[PDB]
Swiss-Prot record, chain B:
Annotated source species: Homo sapiens
Top-level division of the source organism's lineage: Eukaryota
Originating gene: PNMT
GO biological process terms held by the UniProt record: catecholamine biosynthetic process; epinephrine biosynthetic process; methylation
Broad enzyme group: transferase
Pfam families tied to this protein: NNMT_PNMT_TEMT
Keyword terms of this UniProt record: Catecholamine biosynthesis, Methyltransferase, Phosphoprotein, S-adenosyl-L-methionine, Transferase
Similarity field: Belongs to the class I-like SAM-binding methyltransferase superfamily. NNMT/PNMT/TEMT family.
Regulation of activity: Inhibited by methyl methanethiosulfonate, phenylglyoxal, tetranitromethane and diethyl pyrocarbonate. Inhibited by 4-oxo-1,4-dihydro-quinoline-3,7-dicarboxylic acid, 4-(benzo[d][1,3]dioxol-5-ylamino)-4-oxobutanoic acid and 1,4-diaminonaphthalene-2,6-disulfonic acid.
UniProt binding sites for S-adenosyl-L-methionine: Y22, Y27, G66, S67, Y72, D88, N93, D145, V146, A168
Designated name of the protein: Phenylethanolamine N-methyltransferase
Segments crossing the lipid bilayer: none
PANTHER family: NNMT/PNMT/TEMT FAMILY MEMBER (PTHR10867), PHENYLETHANOLAMINE N-METHYLTRANSFERASE (PTHR10867:SF18)
Length: 257, 268
């Protein structure tokens, strides 16, 4: 884990959410695919409630753009203080915040409600109530007496579990840990890297457990979920850049039973 | 009656027209705020998008009459016409358009309008691609005077006759009275092929507006006067809608009471 102490948010953001990966004009790219998975899932109207927790948010907000209109109380989390600060800069509109507006605009485009991207960002900022430390390796990831309303009605988590677990067994336990935060009958939207073993974040070099779609499906089942949806995006050559060795991205919609 | 004097008054007044002040007055918040679906900006873009979505308005060439320094009126049009001519009476406006065509930082930022057009067109198009296509399809920017029998002049570069005309907030803003407005419509109608389409946007019951130091005179027209002018010029009126300006959009930049949108097809 000590590897994460060198994690640089700006390098991470540049590596994954600036062009080419962060170019949203091409409908066949990874960004549009991710936003589409999230928007379509929420458009079913089956993922609803009052409170939601985003697990391992890092310095990003794209994962909550479609979610925020369905949950009035949102908790964002990360293991690193520098990531929580980076989030704070965007949430508070402070100087030097990352520019997420391309993602916000595309979410509005995809959702098709004629919403301006400014209203969308306003709603997300308003509904994110708190940003908390978290460690998915702990039986109680949020600790003993957290300000977060528990259990949550829904969880979101993108590119975290596989990125912090040495092997499949560790991946499984981490999922078990965060699953305790979710109310029975609640929903988990999980996004992650397929068959990845490393990625870079400035001076940090992070180890990743390479997982397959079937392995993800089986882990969700073992954690007591019914898998409602599980899709794969295969990474095209033009998005394989040397910041990592990712082969694909998965999206899972799972419901706790 | 004699038209020269009134037209000289107009030409003189426009020598003080300031494009930047005009842009700010009309295409920046609150009027340029596109978030409220009940606002005038979204209404205009909607009228244009819905008209082009019928598929009924297409062809090869289009002429925008009295573009001024604005491009919003062509955002939905540009996907249907490979050759677009923009025009204005004033060099300073043509220069403004030039800055935007060159994608210069000093140019007015139309991205809020571009994004909204992509939003309502519903094709998942990114605004950068929309702006790139408009820039590619603008083939020329020319002087124009709608008061001349040949508004573009003799032997113009523009492909004539055009398959379609667009014109926003021009005719009523440059005509001393209704008689002049009618003649101006007659003049630009010579530029359009029989069976071609005109999309006309304009101010209802307006008598003045500001563009910096310049306070410009406008002929107050009603919806029925607009409809009759179109019939008189030889159009079938396919659509004529009215937007009533809410009080919070009456900002002291003008005395406009409403905005009209007309879709008309030249008989022939
Ligand atoms: N033990 C732990 N428990 C929970 N999160 C951790 C963790 N160790 C590292 N992390 C966080 O896991 C994140 C992986 S990067 C993914 C960030 C963001 N959700 C995205 O979609 O881009 C980093 O922000 C890292 O700080
Ligand atoms: N005699 C004339 N013939 C054609 N256009 C004229 C004219 N006299 C002034 N104009 C132009 O009429 C425009 C009115 S302002 C409207 C500009 C733009 N089409 C819009 O939608 O915001 C100005 O650009 C002005 O320069
Ligand atoms: N952490 C992370 N974010 C990504 C976005 C697109 C493709 C691969 C990615 N890995
Ligand atoms: N020239 C001009 N542009 C306008 C935009 C909205 C309402 C009135 C307007 N008059």
């Amino acid at each position: 884990a000590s590897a994460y102490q060198r994690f640089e948010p700006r390098a991470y953001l540049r590596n994954n959410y600036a062009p080419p990966r962060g170019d949203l004009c091409n409908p066949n790219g990874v960004g549009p695919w991710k936003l589409r998975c999230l928007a379509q899932t929420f458009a079913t109207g089956e993922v609803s409630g009052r409170t939601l927790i985003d697990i391992g948010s890092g310095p990003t907000v794209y994962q909550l753009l479609s979610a925020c209109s369905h949950f009035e109380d949102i908790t964002m989390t990360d293991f690193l203080e520098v990531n929580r600060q980076e989030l704070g800069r965007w949430l508070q509109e402070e100087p030097g915040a990352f520019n997420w507006s391309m993602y916000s605009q595309h979410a509005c485009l995809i959702e098709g409600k004629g919403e301006c991207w400014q209203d969308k960002e306003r709603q997300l900022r308003a509904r994110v109530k708190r940003v908390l430390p978290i460690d998915v390796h702990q039986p109680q990831p949020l600790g003993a007496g957290s300000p977060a309303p528990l259990p949550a009605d829904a969880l979101v988590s993108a590119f975290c579990l596989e990125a912090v677990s040495p092997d499949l067994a560790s991946f499984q336990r981490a999922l078990d840990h965060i699953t305790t935060l979710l109310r029975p009958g609640g929903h988990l939207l999980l996004i992650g890297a397929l068959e990845e073993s490393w990625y870079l974040a400035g001076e940090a070099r992070l180890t990743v457990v390479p997982v397959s779609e079937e392995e993800v499906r089986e882990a969700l089942v073992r954690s007591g979920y019914k898998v409602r949806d599980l899709r794969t995006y295969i990474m095209p050559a033009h998005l394989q850049t040397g910041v990592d060795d990712v082969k694909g991205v998965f999206f899972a919609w799972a419901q706790k039973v």
